[PDB]
């Protein structure tokens, strides 16, 4: 019965840009890696977005990960990136 927060996990990779020379979006310092920027038409266009919540980080557990441990992922993913995240909305209390 895998069921939880209405925010859907939306697995997608990422690669490293050549201008950018960075993975298109970025990432917190803090443990929580939270997406703090996303490139607008780079590497993560679309893809992400600045305010998700990293839930796996090339098949690893975020729990068991921070923005450290992160840190050399990103720089060892050489072909390609497998970040998944999570796409949650505040649905209710929203008043206008």
Known sequence: ??????????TVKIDKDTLL???G???SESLP????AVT????????LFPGDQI???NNEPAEDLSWERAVDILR???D?????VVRCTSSGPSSG
């Open 55 to 57: 839930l796996q980080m």
């Open 40 to 47: 607008a038409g780079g590497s993560a266009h679309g893809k």
């Open 25 to 27: 979006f970025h990432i």
């Open 80 to 84: 390609s990136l497998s970040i998944t």
């Open 1 to 10: 019965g895998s069921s939880g927060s209405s925010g859907v996990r939306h």
């Open 33 to 36: 890696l939270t997406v703090v």
């Open 21 to 23: 020379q960075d993975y």
């Open 76 to 78: 060892e993913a050489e």
